[PDB]
Every structure is written in C-alpha cells, then in structure tokens.
A paper describes a structure:
The Legionella T2SS exports at least 25 proteins. We also report the X-ray crystal structures of NttE and NttC, the solution nuclear magnetic resonance (NMR) structure of NttA and dynamic analyses for each substrate using complementary biophysical techniques.
NttC is a 130-amino acid protein encoded by the lpw18401 ORF in 130b strain (lpg1809 in strain Philadelphia-1; lpp1772 in strain Paris; lpl1773 in strain Lens). We readily obtained crystals of NttC at pH 8.0 and determined its structure using selenium multi-wavelength anomalous dispersion (Se-MAD) and refined electron density maps to 3.1 Å. NttC has an immunoglobulin-like fold composed of one α-helix and ten β-strands, and residues Cys46 and Cys55 form a disulfide bond between the α1-helix and β5-strand. This is formed primarily by the sidechains of hydrophobic residues and is inaccessible to the solvent. Analysis of the structure using fpocket revealed that the cavity inside the protein has a volume of 782 Å3 and a druggability score of 0.97, which strongly suggests that this pocket may be able to bind one or more organic molecules. In our crystal structure, we could not detect any access to the cavity but using MD we were able to observe a breathable core and a transient ∼12 Å diameter solvent accessible channel form over the course of the simulations. Due to the restricted access to this pocket we expect that a large cofactor is inserted during the folding of NttC, prior to its secretion from the periplasm.
Residue numbers in the entry: 1 to 108
The structure:
C-alpha cells in the first residue's frame, strides 16, 4: 500500500471526492495545488463504504461553489492503492491515474 493518496489539481477550481457518489471527503484538493492524504485517513474516509478492500467515489470540480461539476466515478483498492478507471474525461475536465495512490486533474 502507498503512504499517501497524492492528488495534483492543475485546474483553477477546487476538486473533492464524493464517497459512494454522495458524501464529500474532508480532504479536498485546492486549485493549482498538490495535496497528500496519509493512508490511514483514506481508510477511515472509506469506512462503511468498503467491500473486498474496494471503495468508489464520484470526483467533482468547483466543490467549494454553489454549482459543483460531476467528472465521473472511480474505485480504489485500499491495499494496493490501484485506481481502476485509469482516466476520466467529462464536462471539459480530464483525470489521469499516474500510479498507485496518485493521479492528476487537468482542464479540457
């Protein structure tokens, strides 16, 4: 398992993971910022939403605005940190999985 979940937000809008599609995490990644979440905190964020060490989340942009933007669903193995959908592309945003427990969000 990786030490941290590392998120590279390369957009001008805040990103966040909505656990099981509905529950905002406490660890949003601010604009033009990299953020690293200790792995135990991740495990807990996913507590109650984990089956077979797998946990899904919906990724949103403009998470600190009135109108957030649904980018698409992802699932992660909490023991390998492997993120199954290698890319997303929706609402003129793109997500790319870089390796276990790290990914970047770009605009377009």
């Amino acid at each position: 398992a990786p030490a941290y979940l590392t998120t590279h937000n390369r957009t001008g809008e805040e990103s966040n993971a909505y656990i099981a599609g509905s529950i905002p995490s406490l660890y949003p990644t601010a604009a033009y910022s990299t953020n690293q979440v200790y792995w135990n905190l991740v495990r807990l964020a996913c507590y109650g939403h984990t089956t077979n060490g797998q946990c899904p989340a919906l990724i949103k942009m403009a998470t600190n605005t009135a109108n957030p933007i649904d980018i698409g669903y992802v699932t992660m193995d909490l023991n390998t940190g492997d993120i199954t959908p290698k890319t997303l592309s929706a609402k003129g945003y793109s997500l790319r999985v870089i390796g276990p427990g790290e990914a970047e969000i770009t605009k377009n």
